[PDB]
A paper describes a structure:
Here we report a new antimicrobial peptide belonging to the cathelicidin family, cathelicidin-MH (cath-MH), from the skin of Microhyla heymonsivogt frog. Cath-MH has a single α-helical structure in membrane-mimetic environments and is antimicrobial against fungi and bacteria, especially Gram-negative bacteria. In contrast to other cathelicidins, cath-MH suppresses coagulation by affecting the enzymatic activities of tissue plasminogen activator, plasmin, β-tryptase, elastase, thrombin, and chymase. According to the amino acid sequences of known frog cathelicidins, the predicted mature cath-MH sequence (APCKLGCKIKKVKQKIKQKLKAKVNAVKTVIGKISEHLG) possessed 12 strongly basic residues distributed across the entire molecule, resulting in an 11 charge at pH 7.0.
The small trigonal-shaped crystals of the peptide were successfully grown under Crystal ScreenHT (Hampton Research) conditions of 2 M ammonium sulfate over 60 d at 277 K. While cath-MH crystals diffracted X-rays to 1.95 Å resolution, the crystal structure was solved at 2.20 Å resolution because the initial resolution did not provide a complete non-protein 2Fo - Fc electron density map. The peptide crystals belonged to the rhombohedral space group R32. The crystal asymmetric unit contained one molecule of the peptide with a solvent content of 41.76%. Loop-1 was formed by the first four amino acids A1-K4 at the N-terminal part of the structure, and loop-2 contained the last four amino acids E36-G39 at the C-terminal part. Non-protein electron density was interpreted as 13 water molecules and two chloride ions. The stabilization of the α-helical monomer was provided by a disulfide bridge formed from sulfur atoms of C3 and C7 and by several H-bonds between O atom C3 and Nζ atom K8 at 3.15 Å; between O atom Q25 and Oγ1 T29 at 2.70 Å; between O atom of I31 and Oγ S35 at 2.92 Å; and between Nζ K33 and Oε1 E36 at 2.68 Å distance. Further stabilization was realized by interactions between Sγ atom C3 with Nζ atom of K11; O atom of Q14 and Oε1 Q18; and Nζ atom of K17 and Nζ atom of K21. The monomer was more positively charged at the N-terminus than the C-terminus and shared high secondary structural similarity. Finally, compared to cathelicidin-PY, cath-MH contains a larger helix and five extra hydrogen bonds.
Residue numbers in the entry: 1 to 39
Write the structure that this text describes.
């Protein structure tokens, strides 16, 4: 496990990116729901 500071910064960035992407995905899903025409 030779993960030094540059490596640690990457881990943190990826965690944040991952969470924010899930939020976007959540929001886009809902955009899709309302973009449906009735019937
Ligand atoms: Cl975050
Ligand atoms: Cl996307």
């Amino acid at each position: 496990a030779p993960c030094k500071l540059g490596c640690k910064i990457k881990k943190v960035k990826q965690k944040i990116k991952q969470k924010l992407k899930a939020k976007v995905n959540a929001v886009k899903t809902v955009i899709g729901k309302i973009s449906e025409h009735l019937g």
